[PDB]
Ligand binder design. Structure first.
Ligand SMILES: NC(=O)c1ccc[n+]([C@@H]2O[C@H](COP(=O)([O-])OP(=O)(O)OC[C@H]3O[C@@H](n4cnc5c(N)ncnc54)[C@H](O)[C@@H]3O)[C@@H](O)[C@H]2O)c1
Ligand SMILES: NC(=O)c1ccc[n+]([C@@H]2O[C@H](COP(=O)([O-])OP(=O)(O)OC[C@H]3O[C@@H](n4cnc5c(N)ncnc54)[C@H](O)[C@@H]3O)[C@@H](O)[C@H]2O)c1
Lengths: 290, 290
């Protein structure tokens, strides 16, 4: 019996698909940015807001909680109140619910931005955490609360930090922006910068697999970075998008984490950045139609 | 024009006394653990709850905010909701209010417990922060939020980590308990364990002088540990309490931060632990009369 908060969203729904195969799954989601159609039918969907509704009764008997729910991290035009509410408060309320209900296992999706302006790349898990963005700070705040509840109310946790996950059911970012442009005009793709900018992506299946793998970690609190073995330039992303869409437009030009910790434990990503991107472009295409 | 939250409390009142000598002070306090009588008469006392009221008219024109307000850190007998509301939520709401009012300088009293189980003593500011207590976690969360607001909304902050501050106006601590118990049976004092526990104490004036001194730090976010140069044993504390009370009961037996960063800056605590304790005891005896 496992509870998956945010199980109706991108990463969450994938987690549900994998766990539902051998666990009774209860999903808690207010569908603010999720889609109930993504939820496996073998699971029970409870439509509740972690920041305002009492959820201890939905946690009754649960052996573990995969806390995947959170506010969408956006570029700039961010709202402090929603980030606070859906990240900090929601997590605090969940921990209290877990405490009262007796649930002592939590798997949490943090974020690569807890490291702020890191001066060493690839960034290891023991690198200082001085977030500069509100989303990063909210997540580091969540990690602190989790850590303390683990020591104070005897819980065990697995915290995963990662940057950009792509794959079926996700709809935003560079790949999305390119598709929507080429749909708008198949003969020209605008690229901000000179395309030499680098990016790194982890394919969704690898994100899920890493989180499952890290569970063998047996410290009271286990922190792991998840990421790909490489990088990819925006210029190459554009080409792959054009390749899969079968196009040849005219191009108009206007935080890497170290995974050595998980790798010494025995995990390795199956896909590199280019493969993650190519598979993600195909699934996004069909996703937008579906 | 400076606003001091928690200005009716122990550390806060002393800050107000010192700052009022050359600045217009506005104290925001809900008089929970604080005493109105401790507020300097030259200051304006605004009775409000940081975690619930509209404090916009009060931050108007302020140059900086000394955020001293917070929940009492108790022993096992703590109220998560109270710690969350008076530390995390109050701080979030304050930062929002500051943002809205245009105040961009914040001085914050954090805590030594953000370091959890420090394995490096004297503990430096760059030591990892993995709190084991809800109080420590609540403060680390506050630090994260403050650091992100500084970077996102152009603010500058001075964060102070410390423990065991003693002196006039404080009523929580080993000294207070010893005097209280001694006031029952002046011929027999019960001391936990063999009382060989070392404990670094900082006298209130050194805490306040350190905070004022640290303002010289010119990074966007300045973090400093505060403390005295040494430690003192529990048994020794009991002795000094008796030495001052003029009693000779028989004893019935039932961490150190590095300040090299502030010292490099030119600050030095005036009193060692024994001196802070001796002065604090006399301060309390006289406090109990008022
Ligand atoms: N997608 C990425 O690239 C990425 C990168 C780093 C970290 N993360 C983290 O991974 C987690 C999942 O991200 P995602 O991409 O799948 O986003 P998402 O928006 O698809 O999934 C989050 C789900 O949480 C639910 N939710 C939000 N607030 C809620 C509340 N108060 N009560 C109940 N449900 C609530 C939403 O309805 C949504 O379905 C988040 O915690 C996020 O911070 C994602
Ligand atoms: N005294 C110590 O040994 C020590 C050690 C470490 C950290 N600190 C930190 O130093 C700061 C001051 O500690 P203190 O010893 O003076 O404690 P204190 O309890 O005397 O002072 C806190 C003040 O905050 C006010 N307050 C609390 N909640 C409030 C709210 N919601 N709205 C408005 N006012 C509110 C109280 O009325 C009180 O006057 C705190 O942030 C504390 O965590 C103190």
């Amino acid at each position: 019996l496992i509870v998956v908060t945010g199980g109706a969203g991108f990463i969450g729904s994938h987690v549900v698909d994998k766990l539902s195969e051998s666990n009774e799954i209860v999903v808690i989601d207010n569908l603010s940015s999720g889609n109930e159609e993504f939820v496996n039918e073998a699971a029970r969907l409870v439509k509740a807001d972690l920041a305002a509704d009492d959820i201890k009764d939905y946690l009754k008997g649960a052996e573990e909680v995969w806390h995947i729910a959170a506010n969408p991290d956006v570029r700039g035009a961010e709202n402090p109140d929603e980030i606070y509410r859906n990240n900090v408060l929601a997590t605090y309320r969940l921990l209290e619910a877990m405490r009262k209900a007796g649930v002592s296992r939590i798997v949490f999706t943090s974020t690569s931005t807890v490291y702020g302006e890191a001066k060493v790349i690839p960034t290891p898990e023991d690198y200082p955490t001085h977030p500069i963005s509100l989303y990063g700070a909210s997540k580091l705040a969540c990690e602190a609360l989790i850590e303390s509840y683990c020591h104070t109310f005897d819980m065990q946790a697995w915290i995963y930090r990662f940057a950009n996950v792509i794959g079926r059911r996700s709809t935003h970012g560079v790949i999305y922006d390119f598709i929507m442009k080429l749909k708008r005009n198949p003969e020209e793709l605008e690229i901000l910068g000179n395309g030499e900018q680098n990016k790194s992506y982890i394919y969704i299946s690898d994100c899920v697999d890493a989180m499952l793998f890290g569970l063998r970690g047996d410290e009271r609190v286990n922190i792991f970075n998840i990421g790909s073995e490489d990088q990819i330039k925006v210029k190459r992303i554009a080409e792959i998008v054009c390749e899969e869409l079968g196009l040849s437009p005219r191009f108009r030009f206007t935080m890497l984490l170290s995974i050595e910790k998980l790798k010494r434990l025995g995990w390795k990503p199956r896909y590199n950045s280019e493969e993650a991107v190519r598979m993600a472009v195909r699934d996004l295409v069909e996703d937008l139609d579906e």
